[PDB]
Nucleic acid binder design. Structure first.
Ligand SMILES: [Zn+2]
Length: 190
DNA sequence: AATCCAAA
């Protein structure tokens, strides 16, 4: 569908750091082009997707959300001599292998600046932290989603049918706690 | 310290 189901958004983007039950990953994406040295939104280069679940018929191995996203890029036919900024709002941050693949992509495509804004930090059984450091070293700008970013995703990706964004309890404090943890990760204190 | 991360 054109827009994301609102219950799906609210469940998957909740940012309580240690909450259980989120065994899918959702990713909303938007692209801007640098023109007259301003970032200008490419209206048709935006959307959302989820991971292909493990054991789903026709894709029994599954495919993580970040890989489905990278798959859609060549079909955009981005112009080789223009600078782009690609922003991904992710419900879980990249696992180690996804982080390595996104780092490979940005290493091969230097005209693309990747920003990852995540609701929660995916631990990947202790392996994700090194992957996030590797992705940052390759040039990605990784941050924790804040209130205004959740509201932007509600307003522009969700099938809200006119309902306003309703923040869940503790949103801001969760964002700020996760931001401290991400800072510790990226500077190798964790 | 560990939480948390499809699989019961
Ligand atoms: Zn992954």
């Amino acid at each position: 569908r054109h827009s994301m189901d609102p219950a799906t958004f609210t469940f998957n983007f909740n940012n309580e750091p240690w909450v259980r039950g989120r065994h899918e990953t959702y990713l909303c994406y938007e692209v801007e082009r640098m023109h007259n040295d301003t970032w200008v939104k490419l209206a048709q280069r935006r959307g959302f997707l989820a991971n292909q679940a493990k054991h789903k018929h026709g894709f029994l191995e599954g495919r993580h959300a970040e890989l489905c996203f990278l798959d859609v890029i060549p079909f955009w036919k981005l112009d080789l001599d223009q600078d782009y900024r690609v922003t991904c709002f992710t419900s879980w941050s990249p696992c180690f292998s996804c982080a390595q693949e996104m780092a490979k992509f940005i290493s091969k495509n230097k005209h693309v600046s990747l920003c990852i804004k995540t609701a929660r930090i995916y631990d990947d059984k202790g392996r994700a932290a090194e992957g996030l450091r590797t992705l940052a070293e390759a040039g990605a700008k990784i941050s924790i989603m804040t209130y205004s970013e959740f509201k932007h995703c509600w307003d522009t990706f969700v099938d809200h049918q006119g309902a306003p964004f309703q923040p869940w309890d503790g949103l801001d404090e969760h964002s700020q706690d996760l931001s401290g943890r991400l800072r510790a990760i990226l500077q190798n204190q964790e």
